[PDB]
Write a protein that binds this ligand. Structure first.
Ligand SMILES: Nc1ncnc2c1ncn2[C@@H]1O[C@H](COP(=O)(O)OP(=O)(O)O)[C@@H](O)[C@H]1O
Ligand SMILES: Nc1ncnc2c1ncn2[C@@H]1O[C@H](COP(=O)(O)OP(=O)(O)O)[C@@H](O)[C@H]1O
Lengths: 348, 152, 127
């Protein structure tokens, strides 16, 4: 017995932990195993109506099984307690015990990581949009959905020039703390109206699963609104070129939190604020480019490369204020039919 | 049995005490040990959104291990109760038992001190700023961060 | 009981619209759809809409035709619902189009529209 316990490891996941359901879900979908036992798990939702949405799925269940992950032959037991009762889920106390050789101990993290991913793939966030209601932020517009950054198409370098500046600003806590300066940052997306600024900000907030506390342009409560922001938020200031200016700069310098404080700013025409600590990353998202038109055409209609060029040289002529909102409009009205778009969009 | 209990000490940290999670966290990060058993601990935060922040970490777990702190060869057991259930965390009653020679009893405080430091390094305070609102003090400006005296 | 082909021309369009989540998400367009059942009064439009909602076990948030609160009504709809707009030919028009383009939810947003005589709204994304 001592030699056997001397060449193996264990891993107990007990029924209280969140990583218990995740692991059974993972082991259900593993291709190569031999699980003689099975247990039904049935979710069952009754809505406000008598209507029922119900779904059942089988899992390993009590008794030991086997599995082969990467040439390991892991042995798993699942056990129930005959005496103890959990009060969180109203079920007896359960325990999963994984057991492989000591040499492959490093596999366990991998397994759990996989489980976490299969857990995180299903649960999807929703970017709540808060808004100003006097001097207090209220939710508005019951949760939206993530806008999925490939969906917004802007110029060639701007998609990475901001997705890496922000990813750096999320890693410079020590750098901002040791210098004794506040840990905040502003941004200035500027261009013509309808270029996809707000869409990009929402896509970025969905990337970082934060919440957009949108505010469009009162000076005494603006400071109170800046100071009192919820957890995990991204401030957005639409049309900063509509304004009290000294109070704006005062409150903008006086924004604080317990963590990062990103504050994007969008304006239709940007003509003191550009000093670092205030706005420090200005980039110009403008009208459509022959790269943007190609990428939109390939976004709507997967494959079918031949038509793509035949659109671009067509849109090279009769173009004054060609904007990506216009391309989205003239491409959605001719959906699943690029040949109609070839003659429709070219004339507008 | 009496001679053996006559040259050793014990130290029971029971699952109610705050110094239970601290010590397992410390023993996870100790370089030199031999811990055949392991237990997952997964923190899992669901925000106002459906978004999830989750993180798992392995700890010693039930069954006895060994450790060498400063030339001591401390023996540690971790046990679960098959009958009793705690209501504070909803888990069975657990107990860690350290055991070294009597001569190195003075090590225990050192160990616990180290654990406390590894506990106190992560938990960081935030200097709340109260202010006057008529004749009563109200919080203002949701908690700041420490300004780290070398910075000024 | 309605005409020969109309019972399937809508029960399969809707059944397709319940399966195009990825198609509407990847294109970056909102995941909504309108419908315009038109004909003489008393032809069985509302009865068909209620039968369809019973088919999909949703809830009919009926609304018959104020412009400032119409947007608030459009935005705040309960879970598992099917909007119904009776007599869209009775109207503020610009505010109607603005709020109709500004309807959102966390899932499908179907919005049937019934009118007794249908004589800009017919663009996709709208009706
Ligand atoms: N690159 C783009 N990709 C996808 N949709 C876009 C893009 N540019 C504009 N749009 C669409 O244009 C419409 C309005 O643009 P919006 O971003 O609201 O304008 P602005 O940010 O200039 O105020 C939205 O429906 C949005 O999806
Ligand atoms: N095919 C049908 N099946 C069942 N009831 C019908 C049918 N056609 C008409 N009716 C009857 O017509 C009546 C009025 O229908 P309603 O939905 O109010 O008409 P409309 O939508 O034109 O205002 C109802 O009492 C309904 O039962």
């Amino acid at each position: 017995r001592v030699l056997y316990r001397q060449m193996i490891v264990d891993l107990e996941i007990q029924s209280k932990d969140k990583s218990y359901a995740w692991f059974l879900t993972w082991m259900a979908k593993h291709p190569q195993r031999v699980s003689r036992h099975l247990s039904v798990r049935t979710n069952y939702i009754q809505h406000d109506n008598g209507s029922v949405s119900t779904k059942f799925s089988l899992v390993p269940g009590p008794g030991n099984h086997w599995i082969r992950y990467k040439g390991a032959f892991i042995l798993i037991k699942r056990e129930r307690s005959a005496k103890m009762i959990d009060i969180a889920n109203g079920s007896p106390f359960e325990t999963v015990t994984l057991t492989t050789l000591y040499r492959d101990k490093h596999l366990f993290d991998d397994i759990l990581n996989e489980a976490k991913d299969i857990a995180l793939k299903t649960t999807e966030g929703k970017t709540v949009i808060y808004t100003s209601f006097g001097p207090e932020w209220r939710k508005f517009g019951q949760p939206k959905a993530k806008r999925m950054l490939p969906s917004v198409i802007l110029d060639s370098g701007i998609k990475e020039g901001i997705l890496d500046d922000v990813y750096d600003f999320m890693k410079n806590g020590k750098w901002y703390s040791d210098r004794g300066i506040p840990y905040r940052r502003g941004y200035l997306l500027y261009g013509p109206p309808g270029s996809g600024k707000t869409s990009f900000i929402q896509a970025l907030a969905g990337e970082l699963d934060y919440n957009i506390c949108i505010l469009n342009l009162t000076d005494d409560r603006l400071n109170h609104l800046m100071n009192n922001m919820p957890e995990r938020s991204i401030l957005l200031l639409e049309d900063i070129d509509a304004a009290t200016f000294s109070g704006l700069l005062n409150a903008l310098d006086g924004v604080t939190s317990s963590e990062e404080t990103i504050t994007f700013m969008t304006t239709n025409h940007p003509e003191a604020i550009m000093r670092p600590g205030r706005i420090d990353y200005k980039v110009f998202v403008g009208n459509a480019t022959p790269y943007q038109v190609e990428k939109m055409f390939m976004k709507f209609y997967p494959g079918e490369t031949d038509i793509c060029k035949k659109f671009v040289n067509s849109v090279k002529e009769l173009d004054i204020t060609v904007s990506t909102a216009q391309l989205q409009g003239l491409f959605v009205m001719n959906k699943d039919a690029p040949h109609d778009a070839l003659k429709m969009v070219s004339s507008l």
